[PDB]
Symmetry: D2
Subunit: 472 residues, 4 copies
């Protein structure tokens, strides 16, 4: 168990249920469930399949002899057919009617779509929880004033909750894309035959178009889908796999930016990721870096799907089978692992207001030179061009004292001792109040959380209790 390379997604990062969502046992159970639905539908459509045969497949659907299946696959060189005969050996009564009229893609593609849809159902509450936990921090810190940063340089002040709403906005689009995949984009393949023309099922029903349509119509309903593709080749359109990985890779870009921002702010000592207390105020963003690492892998996992779809030859070419075994589950496992890390970091995100105030104060004298300029022109009868060049000379020499000599910012005292800036000497004691410079930061948080966030996660307000633990 330790001598072989263990993929870290399955063993170290992704959740238990997502790993089991793509296990081989889960897959063959779906294969056997589809053969059951096929026989149930064929029987109720006029075909002679006794319910004694159907209940025999039902009785031993969950007991798969993988020892026989592996031996069958080595001798038949066909994985689906190996499990056809394995299920047939376990079901002697129902053996002649198993997989009747269908091809291996009937169980292959339809069970994939079931696993892919169930994978989204696993991811969706975790995206919603990430939104919920960040939305509570954004509301909690909607007035916590801090320095905004452009080019990683100090910019005009904002609030920490206002910055968090910037992160949530991206998560709102990922949730929207994932819901669209599950509710609209992903359809059922159904029973289309070898090349999508349903010729085999047309033979079985003696050329009755209506029964063949209803067979496909019923199977789509039994498997939990709303509609099926109508003009497939042998498979469902592989462009669907692009849509899935694109949406999942899109989550990776969001998680990577959020956690890079958290890593950046951690170096300014303004925030810190949570951690197991098993030092508390002097450590590294270990979890945010891991999320960035896993998000970057997820970010690029889509590059091999697009080129795979572009070389699907005509009705079907098998050079998509192996790569889909890898990319699709690992894309879900990485997305699951990133959202697990993101919710944990969002839940226990620590902030340090006094450092935010200290960093804000040391840069504020430079950030107010323009509203001081407006004050001199509007209230001091100062010439715009003349007051600007003088403020520049004072700012230029004060900025030199900061970087060249390592001194503290004394720009405000430079203007105080300057006769020219007499009209603003009275406002200088309180000109560095960060509370009147944040514009509508607080109000934007309120409207955004109330109007855009709350309705977007409304249907998940019953799945938001589960906290995200990081044991490793």
């Amino acid at each position: 168990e330790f001598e072989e390379y263990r993929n870290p997604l399955t063993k170290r990062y992704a959740s238990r249920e997502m790993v089991c969502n793509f296990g081989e046992k889960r897959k063959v159970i779906l294969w056997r469930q589809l053969w059951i639905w096929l026989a149930e539908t064929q029987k109720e459509l006029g075909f002679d399949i006794t319910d004694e045969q159907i209940n025999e497949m039902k009785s031993q659907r969950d007991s798969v002899d993988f020892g026989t299946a592996a031996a069958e696959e080595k001798a038949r060189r066909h994985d689906v057919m190996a499990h056809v005969y394995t299920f047939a050996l376990a079901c002697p009564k129902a053996a002649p009617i198993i997989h009747l009229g269908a091809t291996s893609c009937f169980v292959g593609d339809n069970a994939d779509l079931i696993m892919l849809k169930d994978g989204l159902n696993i991811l969706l509450p975790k995206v919603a929880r990430c939104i919920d936990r960040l939305a509570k921090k954004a509301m909690l810190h909607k007035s916590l004033i801090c320095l905004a940063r452009t080019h990683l340089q100090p910019a005009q002040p904002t609030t920490m909750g206002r910055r968090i709403c910037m992160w949530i906005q991206d998560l709102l689009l990922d949730l929207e894309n994932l819901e669209r995949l599950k509710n609209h984009t992903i359809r059922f393949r159904g029973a289309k035959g070898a090349v999508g023309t349903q010729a085999s099922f047309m033979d079985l029903f003696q050329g009755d178009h209506q029964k063949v349509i209803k067979l496909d119509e019923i199977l789509t309903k039994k498997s939990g889908f709303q509609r099926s593709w109508c003009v497939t080749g042998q498979t469902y359109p592989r462009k669907v796999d692009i849509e899935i990985t694109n949406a999942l890779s899109n989550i990776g870009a969001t998680v990577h930016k959020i956690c890079t921002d958290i890593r950046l702010l951690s170096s300014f000592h303004e925030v810190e990721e949570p951690f197991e207390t098993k030092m508390p105020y002097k450590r590294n963003p270990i979890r945010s870096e891991r999320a960035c690492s896993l998000a970057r892998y997820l970010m690029h996992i889509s590059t091999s799907m697009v080129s795979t779809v572009s070389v699907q030859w005509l009705e079907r070419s098998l050079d998509d089978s192996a790569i889909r075994r890898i990319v699709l589950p690992e894309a879900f496992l990485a997305a699951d692992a990133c959202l697990t890390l993101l919710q944990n970091i969002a839940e226990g995100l620590i902030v340090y207001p006094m450092v935010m105030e200290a960093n804000l104060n040391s840069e504020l004298p430079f950030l107010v030179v323009e509203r001081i300029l407006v004050k001199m022109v509007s209230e001091g009868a100062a010439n715009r061009q003349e007051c600007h060049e003088r403020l520049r000379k004072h700012s230029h020499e004060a900025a030199a004292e900061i970087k060249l000599k390592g001194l503290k910012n004394s720009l405000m005292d430079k203007l105080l001792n300057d006769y020219y800036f007499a009209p603003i000497h009275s406002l200088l004691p309180t000109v560095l109040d960060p509370s009147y410079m944040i514009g509508r930061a607080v109000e934007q948080v309120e409207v955004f959380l109330n109007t855009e966030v709350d309705p977007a996660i409304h249907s998940y307000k019953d799945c938001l209790a589960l906290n995200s633990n990081i044991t490793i």
Copy 2:
């Protein structure tokens, strides 16, 4: 003009109007139009901006002195500010109120969104035309029976129009994704200020939240958008650029598969791309290969956008400006060039029914061995296992005569001279009729074209007349 490297997208492949959609003249006109809308909105919101100033900006919006702008940019090292002062020099009356309270991203990001939206408006009718031209070929050849191919090997017969509907289904999803970008995903940035808090506009309106909201509300309306982002940083969420390139790269995967299929079938002499007659029945798929080449470049153009978005630091970092100048226009130009090639190839696609019939006939004796087996068991009282092994021995030796000795397929005469297959000797003269093996291929074309294709392109039935000429 020939000494410098000329990007082939702008000179050789993409359409005139898409190239001009991203020209610098078009961009600065948008920049000046946004400054006009800003002044028009600020004036009607209570700010003192005389309409004499507004109409002066209107009079010389379309006349840009690029000689001054380049000189300003070299001395200011800022492209937007260079065009602020250039527009200010041309507008002495309105100079003090140009770009009032806004940052360079007010014109930078909003004009990009206008150009990106207009780029989709250029692409959408071309996608619809590609669907329309393929839909007419699919209806025209809904009964043209031909060999379907899996693993590039002969499979059960289908029809050429049924295979074309497989291509159209992918184009229906690309049209759907592009419409969703333009109608829903792409929003306006509006007037958000330096860090998205609208602090500057709050200063100008003396802290009136209502006027600041209406300023953003009116600008969103004037620029032709329905809503704006509410919690930006300095820019609109760059995840939008991922959504755009992902949808455009998705078109590349579709075009590449369609044209690879056309290239494959051209080697079997069953189809041939159109060509300028300026030999007619002996040439190379030059246009389909070019479309594949341009589609593959478009397919992967999205890989640099996702990593760019993932490293956007906090409120804004300028390492997305240069790459967006390249990737976004070239993604549109390549998509435009592929759809131009795809419509041209779809319009003049030639088919050769006699080759389709000949290729069908040479492979049909192998494709009917299973329905012959069913005939022997159902009508000849033959044992399934015993009739299967005998059909295999006849098929094995006939397949050896094909590849080893280069002879023609004589499997049907092998069964005719076999006493065992007496019950099927009467059906052997007509057992190779491809008309009863295509299942529901014809009916699937009808339903698909009537129910899914026709409504999807309904709003474009006025833009479908323009044919796609390939001069190069």
Copy 3:
């Protein structure tokens, strides 16, 4: 074992020894071996480490208590430190000197480089075998004349062995790149300390530069390397990981082209991949498609490494740890799986000369029209422009009979019954001899195999016996 998602590379495609090359047991054994070499080197450099301590680490290097290590990691949240204390508990005598003066990257990075180098040593003989098996087929079929294909259209005749040499040329460059990685590019990290300055080891040796240099010099020798990096940060330059995945992705591009070519020629019935006989002359390129699928995944696995290296912050940032656990082993496992498939397909590649002759004959009358034109001008006193237009009219109508009416090529009989082409009527009986049109195809195979292939694999002529079995 079947309820969890099993990565198909480790379970289905890659070889046993490559899977075990990256197992966790193998890794910790390397970690313990490096701590041994560290103590052995420190002891022989003047530090007080008794050989009783060293042999205690030696006695229980191969017995790893993973139960303790997992419990230590959950409480310490550090995988290396968990195995420091686990090895320390198993080695009470040597516990105080384990990991002395080094950081976790001493075992982390150095053991990775050992595993990466050993991975290349696994791949190199398999690349050589792929070259050897293809070189034997190329020599075997150096005179087997067949149709060359451009734009997938028939071109001038070549030979099958000459086409195989085209494949081998790409494999010669992949072998060359892999040897360069192992012999030159990959260096040792050594003992550099926390930030690469060796400050800790300088403290231990009381500031003796010479002992610190020799410590790094000896460790590089003991671990089987020739040199070490001199100016690292905390890790070895991650650009090395780009070089590795680029070379491995390069193998994927080669394997994909070779096996796509085999898939294409299989549809013309001129070749066929090997297969387990457990129909023989009527089947699908199942193995070549799987190789294409795995090669395409390997082709793109490099895209996440380049962006990881580009965001390594300053001396070290941990957002490369998780993705390196995935990409580096899976890149080796996929490369190993592709070369396994490629050698198997190369060993048992079947050719069909009579189909090659038949396909050649049906297209030869079009491929000789230009040398007939030269014959008419050089020997028949024909005007070039006048003889060209007449040959075109005969070729145009013959090409129409092929595609429009499905008839056989009767161009040679069109020229025979034409009075104009009297000077070439005598050569017409034998003008379709493919043996005088292949140029230097045979001689090129001889020189290439003797001068370029044989020396390139000379050092592997003892590893070429092992055949490649595909059980699945």
Copy 4:
């Protein structure tokens, strides 16, 4: 000139000579030069080509009538053939022997290889200059002590020049890879004919293998190459294009990391990029961000080349022509633009020692707790476990005063007033001297610059004078 989209690489970022290296005029001149060399070689090999014909091609090689060529291409739909007839119209004497026996890839592929090789000759001195300028800064600041950063958190002190050597090491590998491409990997295609068998040239020389070999041997020499491929299809192995873009993309990863590091350190006010003085000590890393943006585009430009090579069908398929027109020149233009930015930033890189000392001092009391622990055990007879827990309690509460209360680090005064730490009270006044903690940082710079950098750029010591100006 402003109405059409102008690719920013050609107009804004890349150098003049690199843009002209891929211009169409430069290409056709190479096409005409190859036809000249072909005639010169054929004439001196026994073929009847009078030097009057050869000098006529020589006289008007540089005067290309692009008006005729564009008209020829529109009517012939073939760009090479259009310039064959255009050159033929300008050369009536030599018209019958132009392009004799060769195919369009003779000029197409060989001129590409000449342009690609000349592109490397443009890049190589710029890589060397980047190394030279960084090596001078590394030597200049080999003793400038500063804080090293892991996880973007403060780590053990190093020196600025020692950190720069970390950047140079990556550039040494890119220079090494580029030299290997130009001197070894890139070969000549030569005169191989339509499918690489040289059948046409064998016809012209009446089947003389020796003259055909010498024709290819001489052309390889005349064009400035050392050897040619021997077993091509119609083109040179497109894997070469992968090797080129991989090496160029590798430069992008290096430039992106260097300039991200410069962007990070600029936010700590320890360095600052150069800038046109046309504020000086308060601005944004505009140039480093642009380099990151262009490097990221270059980083991923390789993703479309690998998939293009993987789908080259058999002897040749034309779906690589269009994408090679785009990717190969833009990869060189982006690499050229990044190295231009990198050298400019390296030349004028500003450092601020007092900020480095201030940042170092505020974090040093935490970075010395472990060597204080060693001092207490080695010199104060303190128990290791007992002295560690006490140092932790003092460090834990001091770290809380930093982040919670925003106070300054008073850990050293906490130990001074603690009776337990009496043995280290005397060393406390000077325990924060950063000069004894940097290990071998200074010596590593000396050895690295003298032994690895100086020999690597030895052949470029005549191309190092040219400074890199950034006008935009």
